[PDB]
Amino acid sequence: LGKLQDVVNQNAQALNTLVKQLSSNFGAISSVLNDILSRLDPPEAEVQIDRLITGRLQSLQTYVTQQLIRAAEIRASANLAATKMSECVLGQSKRVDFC
Amino acid sequence: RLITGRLQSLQTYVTQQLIRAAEIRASANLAATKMSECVLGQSKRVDFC
Amino acid sequence: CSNLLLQYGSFCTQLNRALTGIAVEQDKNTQEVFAQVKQIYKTPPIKDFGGFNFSQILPDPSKPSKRSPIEDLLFNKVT
Amino acid sequence: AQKFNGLTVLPPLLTDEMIAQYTSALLAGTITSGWTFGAGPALQ
Amino acid sequence: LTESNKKFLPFQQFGRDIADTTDAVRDPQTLEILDITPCSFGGVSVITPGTNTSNQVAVLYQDVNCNVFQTRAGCLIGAEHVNNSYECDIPIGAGICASYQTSQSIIAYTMSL
Amino acid sequence: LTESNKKFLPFQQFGRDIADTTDAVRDPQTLEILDITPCSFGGVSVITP
Amino acid sequence: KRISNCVADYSVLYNSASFSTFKCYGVSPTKLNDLCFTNVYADSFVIRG
Amino acid sequence: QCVNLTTRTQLPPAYTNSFTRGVYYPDKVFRSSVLHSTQDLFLPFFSNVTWFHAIHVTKRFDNPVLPFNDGVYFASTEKSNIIRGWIFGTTLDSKTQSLLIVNNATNVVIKVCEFQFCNDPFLGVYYHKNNKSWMESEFRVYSSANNCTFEYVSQPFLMDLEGKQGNFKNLREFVFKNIDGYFKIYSKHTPINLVRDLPQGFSALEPLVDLPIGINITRFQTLLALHRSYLTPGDSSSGWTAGAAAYYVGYLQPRTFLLKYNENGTITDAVDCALDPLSETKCTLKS
Numbered sequence: 001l002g003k004l005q006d007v008v009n010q011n012a013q014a015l016n017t018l019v020k021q022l023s024s025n026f027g028a029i030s031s032v033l034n035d036i037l038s039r040l041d042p043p044e045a046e047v048q049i050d051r052l053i054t055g056r057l058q059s060l061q062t063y064v065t066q067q068l069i070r071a072a073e074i075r076a077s078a079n080l081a082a083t084k085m086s087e088c089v090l091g092q093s094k095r096v097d098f099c
Numbered sequence: 100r101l102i103t104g105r106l107q108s109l110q111t112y113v114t115q116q117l118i119r120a121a122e123i124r125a126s127a128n129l130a131a132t133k134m135s136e137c138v139l140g141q142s143k144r145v146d147f148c
Numbered sequence: 149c150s151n152l153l154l155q156y157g158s159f160c161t162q163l164n165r166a167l168t169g170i171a172v173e174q175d176k177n178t179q180e181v182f183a184q185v186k187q188i189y190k191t192p193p194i195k196d197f198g199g200f201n202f203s204q205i206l207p208d209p210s211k212p213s214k215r216s217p218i219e220d221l222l223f224n225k226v227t
Numbered sequence: 228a229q230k231f232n233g234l235t236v237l238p239p240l241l242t243d244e245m246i247a248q249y250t251s252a253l254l255a256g257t258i259t260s261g262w263t264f265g266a267g268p269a270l271q
Numbered sequence: 272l273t274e275s276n277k278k279f280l281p282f283q284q285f286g287r288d289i290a291d292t293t294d295a296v297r298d299p300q301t302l303e304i305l306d307i308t309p310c311s312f313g314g315v316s317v318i319t320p321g322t323n324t325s326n327q328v329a330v331l332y333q334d335v336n337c338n339v340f341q342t343r344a345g346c347l348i349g350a351e352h353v354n355n356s357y358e359c360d361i362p363i364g365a366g367i368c369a370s371y372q373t374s375q376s377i378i379a380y381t382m383s384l
Numbered sequence: 385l386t387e388s389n390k391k392f393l394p395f396q397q398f399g400r401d402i403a404d405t406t407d408a409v410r411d412p413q414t415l416e417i418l419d420i421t422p423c424s425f426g427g428v429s430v431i432t433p
Numbered sequence: 434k435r436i437s438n439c440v441a442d443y444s445v446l447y448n449s450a451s452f453s454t455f456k457c458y459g460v461s462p463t464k465l466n467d468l469c470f471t472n473v474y475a476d477s478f479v480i481r482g
Numbered sequence: 483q484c485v486n487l488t489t490r491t492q493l494p495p496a497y498t499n500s501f502t503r504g505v506y507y508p509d510k511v512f513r514s515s516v517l518h519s520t521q522d523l524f525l526p527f528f529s530n531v532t533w534f535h536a537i538h539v540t541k542r543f544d545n546p547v548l549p550f551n552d553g554v555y556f557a558s559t560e561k562s563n564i565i566r567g568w569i570f571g572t573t574l575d576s577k578t579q580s581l582l583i584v585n586n587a588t589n590v591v592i593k594v595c596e597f598q599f600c601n602d603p604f605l606g607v608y609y610h611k612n613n614k615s616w617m618e619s620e621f622r623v624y625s626s627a628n629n630c631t632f633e634y635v636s637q638p639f640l641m642d643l644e645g646k647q648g649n650f651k652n653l654r655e656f657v658f659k660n661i662d663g664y665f666k667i668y669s670k671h672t673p674i675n676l677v678r679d680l681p682q683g684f685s686a687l688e689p690l691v692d693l694p695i696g697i698n699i700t701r702f703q704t705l706l707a708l709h710r711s712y713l714t715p716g717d718s719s720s721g722w723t724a725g726a727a728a729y730y731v732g733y734l735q736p737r738t739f740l741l742k743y744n745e746n747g748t749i750t751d752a753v754d755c756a757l758d759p760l761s762e763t764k765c766t767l768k769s
């Protein structure tokens with residue numbers, strides 16, 4: 001099944017990419033925010049923390065946009081499936097090459 | 100900062116292209132239904148073909 | 149990290165609201181497709197429909213699950 | 228053009244000739260068979 | 272640096288296009304107008320027959336000009352060209368696909384509608 | 385730190401998963417393999433008539 | 434004597450209660466085990482009182 | 483102390499091809515049922531590589547001072563423990579910290595120092611008359627030593643000092659690396675019944691000891707052991723015997739490798755990304 005497999009694989013790979021985003025520094029000197037706090041003072045390491053915040057915000061925004069587009073496509077497919085049910089299943093449809 | 104600016108521009112372009120692709124997909128679905136109904140037969144739907 | 153997040157709390161509000169809307173839209177999709185009728189119709193015990201064999205789509209009482217043999221084959225096919 | 232900056236344009240899978248061939252086949256089917264070819268074998 | 276067919280006014284040195292890219296420069300040595308065109312175009316693609324079917328693969332170049340077949344969708348190496356047409360399974364572009372048929376090797380042909 | 389049922393090769397100390405998260409660290413006390421699972425999950429919600 | 438690639442506790446070097454004298458400059462004597470160094474050089478010889 | 487050899491007819495080195503060899507664990511973490519790709523120095527698959535002989539039947543004895551690149555691969559189909567150990571260094575003139583990783587009949591001895599390394603150190607085994615056992619007597623590995631800081635012994639390792647001319651029964655592979663001065667050892671003994679053309683089977687390499695030395699390294703050379711029986715006159719000029727052995731030396735290159743971790747936790751396959759387009763397709767899809 002191709003249609004039912006893409007909607008799961010795409011979500012799983014989006015979640016995996018979201019997890020992978022936390023392994024990057026986004027141009028900072030470390031990936032985990034605890035390391036810079038333990039090795040540098042908070043007054044000096046503020047800019048690295050803020051850079052990490054901006055990177056995580058950008059990744060989350062991109063994930064939200066991708067999920068919104070996927071949800072719109074799923075909404076369109078669900079409307080199509082509901083119409084197909086109400087026409088071909090709950091009666092006989094005169095539309096040729098639709099059912 | 101050049102990396103961040105180019106990344107922002109590319110992301111905005113990708114979002115615009117994805118929205119355009121969604122609209123094109125909707126239009127292509129409408130065209131496919133029209134081809135299946137008005138062309139490959141006679142459609143009883145009034146004010147559709 | 150939380151102290152600097154008050155400068156972007158509105159962004160997190162929009163993201164959380166978007167995820168909640170996506171979840172409730174996914175929830176509403178099942179109600180628009182499968183909940184077409186509000187009365188649960190029971191399959192008759194008589195299986196003589198003039199020769200039409202419907203055991204492959206009707207549920208079977210041999211298994212505790214209510215899925216049809218086609219649906220059970222469909223569930224295991226996908227991951 | 229618009230390809231000098233790495234913005235390559237992918238050619239379509241179906242050329243315009245193949246699309247024209249599909250449209251001509253559909254036209255011939257809809258003038259010689261009506262709707263029988265769209266729901267089964269073509270009937271003259 | 273190709274030989275161009277357009278002349279400049281005798282006070283200019285550079286030349287741009289509609290997309291605002293410097294693609295024409297006059298040679299100071301002999302007042303010769305030369306065009307500029309980038310070389311690296313597109314990426315590479317791999318044609319795989321599949322698991323438990325074959326082991327050899329075919330490499331397709333996207334927009335690069337060159338056993339070896341110069342298709343309309345770039346350069347295709349590793350797949351011989353045959354003039355007959357069957358139904359195609361692995362799409363490539365510009366109306367020509369590739370498949371694994373008869374030993375047996377990867378072939379490329381124009382698809383049948 | 386639950387009691388796992390998977391043994392480790394006698395040269396490793398850490399352990400990850402498919403999603404690349406450290407969730408199995410060998411305890412150096414008497415070579416016990418212990419899983420890691422976060423204790424905090426999700427959020428709260430309210431039902432109002 | 435060179436101490437390399439080895440684990441060493443200085444607590445047992447102090448509870449002997451047999452040294453007539455003990456001086457340690459450059460680090461507080463009660464907080465040297467937790468501090469980590471690279472190499473330890475030890476020289477042994479005899480001397481008068 | 484060391485002595486000089488005499489010129490004789492030797493054999494030129496040959497080139498052989500590897501078959502899915504030179505794969506080790508790039509870290510010390512546990513991974514199960516996951517295809518994880520890492521950037522680290524490994525041995526590329528399917529590549530021509532130099533091969534060195536050690537058989538007597540003639541008089542083949544070659545120990546060149548090969549350059550030590552960023553990681554080497556040392557595989558030997560050892561049968562009667564003819565090989566002993568390895569030495570390292572840059573100039574071998576008591577000016578740098580030259581390594582000496584040898585395996586004596588009682589214990590493994592690792593000591594990096596500034597030994598006065600000769601032109602061709604070797605291990606000498608003498609056959610006693612009243613005793614029917616092969617015993618090592620000529621311990622000529624260096625002239626003298628001045629000073630060093632590292633010395634490691636580990637557990638005793640027992641080997642057989644009797645050399646034969648039969649087919650090999652064991653295969654030993656070694657990988658030596660130096661990242662940030664940290665010395666890395668990877669080895670795993672694998673039984674096999676072959677003389678040449680190493681099998682296409684897969685076997686990972688587990689670390690044994692990890693040395694924190696932090697020194698320089700650019701050259702390396704192996705050590706060999708010859709026998710002095712009653713047939714040879716006993717002089718190291720033209721008459722000796724070395725049994726039958728063969729060791730392969732390969733140089734590691736930085737390539738991304740896609741490892742196959744099973745449910746048990748061991749590597750099963752090492753599909754590449756820069757060897758074949760099919761392998762690149764496999765490792766780009768992470769499948």
Ligand SMILES: *[C@@H]1O[C@H](CO)[C@@H](O[C@@H]2O[C@H](CO)[C@@H](O)[C@H](O)[C@H]2NC(C)=O)[C@H](O)[C@H]1NC(C)=O
Pocket residue numbers: 201202203204
């Ligand atoms: C309806 O079709 C099913 C097919 O699944 C029939 O069940 C099979 O019947 C044959 C005949 O005895 C058995 O050998 C098979 O083992 C049955 N398969 C299963 C899955 O039950 C069933 O008999 C048919 N019923 C009618 C009335 O035609």
Ligand SMILES: *[C@@H]1O[C@H](CO)[C@@H](O)[C@H](O)[C@H]1NC(C)=O
Pocket residue numbers: 336337
């Ligand atoms: C590709 O290059 C060859 C030789 O350089 C040339 O003859 C051929 O016309 C080129 N192809 C195209 C499409 O320009």
Ligand SMILES: *[C@@H]1O[C@H](CO)[C@@H](O)[C@H](O)[C@H]1NC(C)=O
Pocket residue numbers: 352353354355
């Ligand atoms: C295919 O057949 C046509 C028929 O004329 C011929 O012109 C062409 O050269 C053939 N191609 C090959 C690859 O044999």
Ligand SMILES: *[C@@H]1O[C@H](CO)[C@@H](O)[C@H](O)[C@H]1NC(C)=O
Pocket residue numbers: 497498528529530
């Ligand atoms: C070197 O490698 C190539 C390709 O693998 C091979 O054809 C050649 O025979 C090798 N050289 C020798 C001396 O074997």
Ligand SMILES: *[C@@H]1O[C@H](CO)[C@@H](O)[C@H](O)[C@H]1NC(C)=O
Pocket residue numbers: 586587588589590591618619621635
């Ligand atoms: C090699 O060194 C070990 C100690 O590490 C020693 O027991 C053994 O006798 C030595 N071998 C020879 C031949 O001296």
Ligand SMILES: *[C@@H]1O[C@H](CO)[C@@H](O)[C@H](O)[C@H]1NC(C)=O
Pocket residue numbers: 628629630631
């Ligand atoms: C060993 O002695 C040499 C003098 O030849 C000196 O340069 C080197 O630093 C010494 N090594 C150590 C570890 O002190």
Ligand SMILES: *[C@@H]1O[C@H](CO)[C@@H](O)[C@H](O)[C@H]1NC(C)=O
Pocket residue numbers: 698699700
């Ligand atoms: C190590 O050797 C390199 C050249 O091989 C040299 O540039 C470098 O200075 C050396 N480092 C030390 C610590 O000797």
Ligand SMILES: *[C@@H]1O[C@H](CO)[C@@H](O)[C@H](O)[C@H]1NC(C)=O
Pocket residue numbers: 745746747
């Ligand atoms: C690895 O462990 C599993 C589970 O205990 C077992 O089924 C499998 O045989 C083991 N593999 C090896 C090579 O021992």
